[PDB]
Write a protein that binds this ligand. Sequence first.
Ligand SMILES: Cc1cc2nc3c(=O)[nH]c(=O)nc-3n(C[C@H](O)[C@H](O)[C@H](O)COP(=O)(O)OP(=O)(O)OC[C@H]3O[C@@H](n4cnc5c(N)ncnc54)[C@H](O)[C@@H]3O)c2cc1C
Ligand SMILES: Nc1ncnc2c1ncn2[C@@H]1O[C@H](COP(=O)(O)OP(=O)(O)O)[C@@H](O)[C@H]1O
Length: 260
Amino acid sequence: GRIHCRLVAKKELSRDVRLFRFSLPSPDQVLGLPIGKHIFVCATIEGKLCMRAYTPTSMVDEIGHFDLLVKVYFKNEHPKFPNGGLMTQYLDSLPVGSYIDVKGPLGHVEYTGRGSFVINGKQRNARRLAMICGGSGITPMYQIIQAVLRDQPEDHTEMHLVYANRTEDDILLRDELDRWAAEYPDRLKVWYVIDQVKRPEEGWKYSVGFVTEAVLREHVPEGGDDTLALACGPPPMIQFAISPNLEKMKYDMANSFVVF
Ligand SMILES: Cc1cc2nc3c(=O)[nH]c(=O)nc-3n(C[C@H](O)[C@H](O)[C@H](O)COP(=O)(O)OP(=O)(O)OC[C@H]3O[C@@H](n4cnc5c(N)ncnc54)[C@H](O)[C@@H]3O)c2cc1C
Ligand SMILES: Nc1ncnc2c1ncn2[C@@H]1O[C@H](COP(=O)(O)OP(=O)(O)O)[C@@H](O)[C@H]1O
């Protein structure tokens, strides 16, 4: 089922990331999206109506609006993908006032409370949570990462994050993560891995490069019992950069591996 939203405001955080501020058909409500799930921002472009999943980054109780952190895929920017992304340039193309119409809640992972998951049906639980995402696949994580902190401190779920990118200025939710990182070290381990390093004149200490066994070993809870791994990054990243290694750390690669 649909809901009629309206881009009430928008912000250009940088040369290609925008913070879109939508408003709900009714001021007295919240998006009410269940932690672990997502919403589809529908639109008909060219002739085809195309669904795209997006996980808002607003505090689950914001009344009257929801924010979307979007990284715009421009055409004339990449050799392999010369024509940009389909739903992003259309969104960067909407003037504040336009209506959009979402439809949730989709997905299959839901953080039902404390360690207690339910994947593809099965209720579950875990204390050590392994998180791995790159670029935009962090929002699916952030919602969770934000939910445990808001359950402080009876939610003892230990979360271990590895957040991949291409450059330092491309680390998305960073101030927020480096803020929490300090507040709740007893439960959130943050580690940045980056492809390049714009200016080391400054001094980048985190890893440089791709995500790999060493990185995983020295950063992600030993694949044991009551230890679940969640991941959200480009297909390749998962395929051969995250999938095999988590086996190499003895995780039950069959029921402990969920992917948004
Ligand atoms: C759970 C979940 C949460 C998500 N949340 C967010 C979110 O909060 N914010 C957000 O910004 N995204 C999020 N996404 C991403 C979303 O599904 C999209 O595929 C993406 O936003 C935009 O793709 P597009 O629609 O613009 O079109 P498409 O062009 O279909 O984009 C996908 C393909 O084209 C490539 N591509 C095209 N142009 C480029 C380019 N210039 N540079 C690099 N690659 C390019 C993509 O990398 C990939 O191969 C989420 C996805 C999931 C599943
Ligand atoms: N072959 C791969 N192996 C390992 N990780 C990958 C691979 N391909 C992409 N990734 C990682 O995930 C990130 C890509 O995120 P994505 O959503 O494509 O947008 P962008 O390409 O702008 O970063 C890269 O920074 C890279 O670290």
